[PDB]
Amino acid sequence: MDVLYSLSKTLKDARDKIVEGTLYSNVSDLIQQFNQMIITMNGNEFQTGGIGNLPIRNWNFDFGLLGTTLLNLDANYVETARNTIDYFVDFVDNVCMDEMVRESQRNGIAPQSDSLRKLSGLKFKRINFDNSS
Amino acid sequence: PKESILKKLEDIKPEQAKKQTKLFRIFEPRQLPIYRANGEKELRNRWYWKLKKDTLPDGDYDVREYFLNLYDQVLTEMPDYLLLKDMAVENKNSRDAGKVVDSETASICDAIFQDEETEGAVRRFIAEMRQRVQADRNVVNYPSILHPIDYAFNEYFLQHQLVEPLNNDIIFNYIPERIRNDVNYILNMDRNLPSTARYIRPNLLQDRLNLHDNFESLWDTITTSNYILARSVVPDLKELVSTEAQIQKMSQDLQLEALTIQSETQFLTGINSQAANDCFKTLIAAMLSQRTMSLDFVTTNYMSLISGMWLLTVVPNDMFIRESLVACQLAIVNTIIYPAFGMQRMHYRNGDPQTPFQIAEQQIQNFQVANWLHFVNNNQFRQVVIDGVLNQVLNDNIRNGHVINQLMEALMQLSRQQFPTMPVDYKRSIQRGILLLSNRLGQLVDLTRLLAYNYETLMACVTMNMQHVQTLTTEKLQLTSVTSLCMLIGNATVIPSPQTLFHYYNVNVNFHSNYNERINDAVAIITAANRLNLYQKKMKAIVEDFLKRLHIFDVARVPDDQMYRLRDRLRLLPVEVRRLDIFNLILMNMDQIERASDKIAQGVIIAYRDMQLERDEMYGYVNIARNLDGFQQINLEELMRTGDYAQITNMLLNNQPVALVGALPFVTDSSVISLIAKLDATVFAQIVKLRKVDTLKPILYKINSDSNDFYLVANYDWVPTSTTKVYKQVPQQFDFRNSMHMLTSNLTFTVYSDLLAFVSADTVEPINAVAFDNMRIMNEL
Amino acid sequence: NQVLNDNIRNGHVINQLMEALMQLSRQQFPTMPVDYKRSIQRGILLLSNRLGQLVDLTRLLAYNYETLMACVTMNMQHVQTLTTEKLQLTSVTSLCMLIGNATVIPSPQTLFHYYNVNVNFHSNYNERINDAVAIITAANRLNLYQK
Amino acid sequence: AQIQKMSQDLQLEALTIQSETQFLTGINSQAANDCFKTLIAAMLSQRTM
Amino acid sequence: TLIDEVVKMLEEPDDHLLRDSELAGLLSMSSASNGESRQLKFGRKTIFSTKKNMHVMDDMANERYTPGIIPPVNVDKPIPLGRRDVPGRRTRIIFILPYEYFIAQHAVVEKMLIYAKHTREYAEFYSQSNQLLSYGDVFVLYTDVSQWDSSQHNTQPFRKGIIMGLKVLQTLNLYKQTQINLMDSYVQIPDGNVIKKIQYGAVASGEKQTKAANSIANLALIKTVLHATKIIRVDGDDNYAVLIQDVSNDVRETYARMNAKVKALVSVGIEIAKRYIAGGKIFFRAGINLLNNEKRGQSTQWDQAAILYSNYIVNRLRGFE
């Protein structure tokens, strides 16, 4: 669960702090956090949906990292990034929605979806950050 | 020293081609008279199985160790491949020629074929018993006799043979999938391989030993090695501005004098007809081996610093020690960039820890200056995996490889700060040196290209998945040489000789193969070592040998420590099917071997109660029990170890029915008499006086009034009343017909060592070579 | 037998060692010049690797002291002696990373000899005590007001 | 053997001004025996050092 | 057999000097030792030259020159002998090895010295240092290992260490052999108008490495013998260190265990063969015999006088007048 959170403030504090112009330094502490994620992911497969009028889509991960190389972000840097974020966006949506429908009495509180039951896994915890929401 | 680790390296030929002759057996059948119940010899005589060499020990422990050696002998004789045309032999009888397998096989036949045996069915079989070839599939059918346990062996030897095929295509394929691809070079062969070819796959799995985690000590020794190895390659440069000429224009461009020194300390830097070649080589290897170097400079040799910037822009910094990048940068920052850029005020105060170069970034403003900082500072290595097989290579930022807009930028930034100032002169000497980098920049652009390629080339040839750690012996590099190489080049283009390259591959190869192999050799042993309970073959043993077989290392000159930790890691490793698959074999039957064969037994029972004796055909009726059903027991091994708890002492004293287990010395007696006198109740006495026992030679009674001159008793009528028989199975008999097996293998093989050689590797004309950018490397005239 | 003992823990349960190490395994960081952490932690590791063995050490003493001890009649309260006994960390350090699969103990005959001595000694102390007392008391009811 | 791998690990002469006062370590083949003995007796004897 | 020291001195150096060691040693001959006064012929005459350099000339122009093959110094071809006398001390002998030995030793020693040149432990070589610097250095224990440098016991370790540490490979190997031939060296020792020939299991001077290698050993020795080492130093037949009855005893017994005859003392002051520091003040001996020379060199009567006056001034400056 807490996992899930990060995945977002990651993107927001991302799709927001990352645009044609800014000087590296305001995101050094950010870029890092980001990459860390990508790694943990790549390789693992996910099952989202399978109930009612809900599309069942599969997701594979195999993406590059980031160019800590440049100084002041050049447009070209953004686009090659936004294209990688828009897979996580369209993803998370399909993730939230999936666990935003299942219910159970006994253990109603805990996670239920084949998507999230795999997130609470230990090998993922390496992601949490900025829990001020 | 120096060429002292290279001759130990070039001189490594693990490529031995293991093979065999003799079919590995252990038991030859033998004679022995037959004893029909009642104890008479009925003549004819039957054939049973006994072992060649009854070596077997005295004491369970010594036993287990014994077998162990078998494992080591098995591996050293471990048949790499096999062929039978080289195993021919002839049959005295048969529909014809007969050509069978292994002298022993032959003997046996002729033998039984004379000592009136079960008759027909035997002679018959031996007859229409031949060989025949199915030419088409290159198959071979050879007959042979062994023994269930023998077929067992030799069999797997056939179903395993580590010798894959060999076609043009495979040769082509073992030449790195990044060189055949590299344009600038050309392949070419002089022959066409036959369908008859084969090749030995030098296996090269990764550092199954993470020999960099804590073991630093050894990595340093490796790096070192891999490093010298590199220099042995790194092409010796070619034609570059005669030493004298350049250094002379050098004095000019600056304007010197009389006791008026300024830039004068920048040319104890000439000597490059030595320095450039060293600086060049040195740099590459460093990268390859991935070794970490130091830095010997001065603070009055500003020039030498400028060139540093050349360097730095390049190697991702993490490639140098910490205490060295620190010095260098601050030296630049404090005496090079502030002191003529009206930025002094604070000659920069520093206190160690954090990044003294870095901090200069978030410092002053100026764009040209500013890009350098980020590009150099946060410039690292790109951790790259696969390269046409798990290479685990470390590459230099695509950017830098010849697309050296870095150099051009490194210069533009230099062309622009030479504007403001502070201590009037000083700037004179300083900027004048800077310009010598600028003019030369046309050429400096080149140097980059060179290395770029070379490193980027040589690379592939390493199967030794190099990583990124801090060395310890630190190779030394002077800014002296650096500086030379710098302003002293151009118009020239040099590149890795073909023959050179291979040689490089080859070595790492072997080496790898050795590491991997010994690893397996190692593991196999240790694991066996455990499922053996040899709490007494202190392992400080195996490790030693291991490392040794990997020359370079001063075995004696390395502690017992690291060594153990070494075991700790090995213990958690699998075994190579080959290795493993054999041990399972040895154990599985182990019992059968031991129990059979004389010179020993297993254990003895002491029932203070008269009793019968089995009538087995081999011996007459004697003292044996293959089952020991009932009664208590007591491991001897765990006895002479435990110090005997007078437990035995008491039972013996009090006379209570009991048994014993383990390695034991049997003793055959005849003259019936001995039995009636109940002799066997003796021996056991001893013990009482001696806590420990080996002095225990148990009693047996081979009895058949036929050979036992004292038949007088078989006479009347009788049944053998003994007190205490013996645990020892019995040598199976010999059913020849089914005791034989059949064999398959191949015909006229053709093994090949090394390979490669088969190519006249040629090179393009230097003046127009290419890098990972399809551009003329070296175009500025 | 007032023979101050010590942790079974120490004894052979050893771990303290394993913990003494694990705590060391996470001390590798900044503050001052580099020729520092480098040299420092490198040394530390030599304790770590050897730890497998350092274990053995604990066991050793554990036993030995725990053994020898037994054969001591002379009770032993803990006191602050007036004299030290210098111990050069030199040797210490050696013993440490310098012990392998060695394993030694007290020769039987050795042990006895030990008992025997303390024994006699004791007996003498006790005995003379009586010899002593006896006299003095007599000394008083005899009015031998002198020695 | 040990002290040699020691120097490899130790990085002996690295700037510091007080060298060779760490290696008086020697005579260890003995030191250990002394340190060992010494330690026990101390205990038993009920000594203090 | 620390005597590791050899490696450091020659660790960093495919130095051109090591690669062309043969030319350098050949050139150095002018500053080379001495050999037997062989017989020679140049042009159409005969001479009795004793200088090692000329021997190279006769041998090169005679196909005899063969440096790759360093003459064995044993029973077959023993070592002649030279000597060095000094007031108040048992006479010491000097080998007389051929030229193959100097050649196979000049480059390595020269490279060794450069290391010494910047290492303060070797108070004799360090920079341009004069005896005053050495005096000032002494934050004490001094010794007289003169006898130890010739103790039959010393030769095995000394040679083993040098060999163990050991174009370049050719040079590295040849130097090693010098030690091996030495391991077993016979001496052409005279005994009247006759020239006897006994064995010799001790080390003597006569090799390039003598003065340099000797120090390595002496330094190695004190390190071994040595209840905070402030300074450690070597100087020919003396080695000292600033770190009393107990320590001196422990030191002497230690020197004794290694079966070595030495004068291990311990103190504010120190004495050694070259200089004695009594009272915090530096002193130098002043006993250079003026009217009795050690050996009959090749100087002339005039030069003999200029030499005598030189000797007189040194004495006046040191004390004796």
Report the amino acid identity of residue A131: N
Q: Which of B771, B756, B751 is nearest to B172 (CA)?
A: B756
Q: Which of E87, E103, E127 is nearest to E52 (CA)?
A: E103
In terms of residues, how long is chain E? Answer: 321
Distance CA(B38)–CA(B717), nearest Å, equals 10
Angle among Cα B439, B440, B443 to the nearest 5 degrees reads: 130
Facing residues of E239 across strands? E234
Distance CA(E298)–CA(E304), nearest Å, equals 10
Cross-chain residue pair D21–E232, CB shorter than 8 Å = no
Residue of C91, C98, C105 to mutate, interface with D, max D Cβ within 10 Å: C91
Angle among Cα B297, B302, B303 to the nearest 5 degrees reads: 95
Interface residues of chain D, partner chain E, Cβ below 8 Å: 4, 7, 18-21, 24, 26
Phi first, then psi, for residue B696 (nearest 5°) are -95, 100
| B508, B559 contact by CB (below 8 A) | no
Phi first, then psi, for residue E156 (nearest 5°) are -60, -60
Side-chain-side CA neighbours of residue B667 (13 Å): 11
Show residues of chain B in contact with E8, CB under 8 Å: none
Smallest CA–CA distance, residue B326 to chain C, in Å, is: 10
| B581, B636 contact by CB (below 8 A) | no
Interface residues of chain B, partner chain A, Cβ below 8 Å: 362, 370-371, 374-375, 378-379, 397, 399
Facing residues of E289 across strands? none
Residue A1: is it exposed, middle or buried by C-beta count within 10 angstroms (0-12/13-18/19+)? exposed
Smallest CA–CA distance, residue B436 to chain E, in Å, is: 29
**What single-letter DSSP state applies at residue B475?**
B
Distance CA(A52)–CA(D28), nearest Å, equals 79
If phi > 0 it is left, if psi is from -120 to 50 it is alpha, else beta; for residue E172 that is: alpha
Distances in Å between the alpha carbon of B668 and those of A125, B625, B626, B684, E300?
74, 16, 18, 16, 102
| B214, B322, B538: residue with CB nearest C49 | B214
Cross-chain residue pair E14–B4, CB shorter than 8 Å = no
Q: How many CB atoms lie within 10 A of CB A118?
A: 16
Distance CA(B572)–CA(B566), nearest Å, equals 11
- Using the CB atoms, write b or e for B647-661: b if 16+ within 10 Å: ebeeebeeeeebbbb
Side-chain-side CA neighbours of residue B396 (13 Å): 28
Rg (CA), chain E: 21
Distance CA(B715)–CA(B703), nearest Å, equals 13
Following CA atoms B627, B630, B632, B636 in sequence, which dihedral angle do they give, to the nearest 10 degrees? Answer: 0
Residue C32: is it exposed, middle or buried by C-beta count within 10 angstroms (0-12/13-18/19+)? exposed
Distance CA(B525)–CA(B528), nearest Å, equals 5
Q: Which residues contact B352 (CB under 8 A, 6 or more apart)?
A: B326, C32, C33, C34
Residue B455: is it exposed, middle or buried by C-beta count within 10 angstroms (0-12/13-18/19+)? buried
Cross-chain residue pair C52–B540, CB shorter than 8 Å = no
* Angle between helices C34-68 and B322-332 in degrees, nearest 10: 160
Phi first, then psi, for residue C89 (nearest 5°) are -50, -15
Distance CA(B348)–CA(B118), nearest Å, equals 106
Distances in Å between the alpha carbon of E29 and those of B106, E41, E83, E98, E171?
77, 20, 20, 12, 17
Distance CA(B607)–CA(B658), nearest Å, equals 7
Widest Cα–Cα separation across chain C: 84
Cross-chain residue pair E14–B3, CB shorter than 8 Å = yes
Rg (CA), chain B: 40
The size of the D-E interface in CB pairs under 8 A is 14
SS3 per-residue string spanning B370-399:
HHHHHHHHCCCEEEECCCCCCCCEEEECCC
Residue E229 contacts D where some CB pair is shorter than 8 Å = yes
Show residues of chain B in contact with A43, CB under 8 Å: none
Distance CA(B251)–CA(B264), nearest Å, equals 8
Residue B536 contacts C where some CB pair is shorter than 8 Å = no
If phi > 0 it is left, if psi is from -120 to 50 it is alpha, else beta; for residue A103 that is: beta
Cross-chain residue pair E12–B476, CB shorter than 8 Å = yes
Report the amino acid identity of residue B391: N
| B583, B71 contact by CB (below 8 A) | yes
Q: Which of B751, B577, B747, B582 is nearest to B200 (CA)?
A: B751
Facing residues of B83 across strands? none
Q: What is the resolution of this structure in A?
A: 5.0
Show residues of chain B in contact with C49, CB under 8 Å: 214, 561-562, 564-565
C11's tokens: 């004894």
Dihedral over Cα of B439, B443, B447, B452: its sign: positive
Following CA atoms E87, E93, E96, E102 in sequence, which dihedral angle do they give, to the nearest 10 degrees? Answer: -80
Show residues of chain E in contact with B4, CB under 8 Å: 169, 172
Q: Which residue is closest to C69 within chain D, CA to CA?
A: D44
| B1, B274, B476: residue with CB nearest E172 | B1
Report the amino acid identity of residue B557: R
Q: How many CB atoms lie within 10 A of CB A10?
A: 22
Cross-chain residue pair B4–E169, CB shorter than 8 Å = yes
* Angle between helices B302-314 and B322-332 in degrees, nearest 10: 120
Q: Which residues contact B178 (CB under 8 A, 6 or more apart)?
A: B387, B388, B460
- Using the CB atoms, write b or e for B325-350: b if 16+ within 10 Å: bbbbbbbbbbbbbbbbbebeeeebee
SS3 per-residue string spanning B593-626:
HHHCCCCCCCEEEECCCCECCCCCCCCCCCCECC
Q: How many CB atoms lie within 10 A of CB A126?
A: 12
Dihedral over Cα of B163, B165, B168, B171: its sign: negative
Distance CA(A36)–CA(A54), nearest Å, equals 31
Q: Which residue is closest to A72 within chain B, CA to CA?
A: B371
Cross-chain residue pair C39–D14, CB shorter than 8 Å = yes
Q: What distance lies between CA A7 and its chain's CA centroid?
A: 4
Dihedral over Cα of E16, B249, B303, B456: its sign: negative
| B103, B703 contact by CB (below 8 A) | no
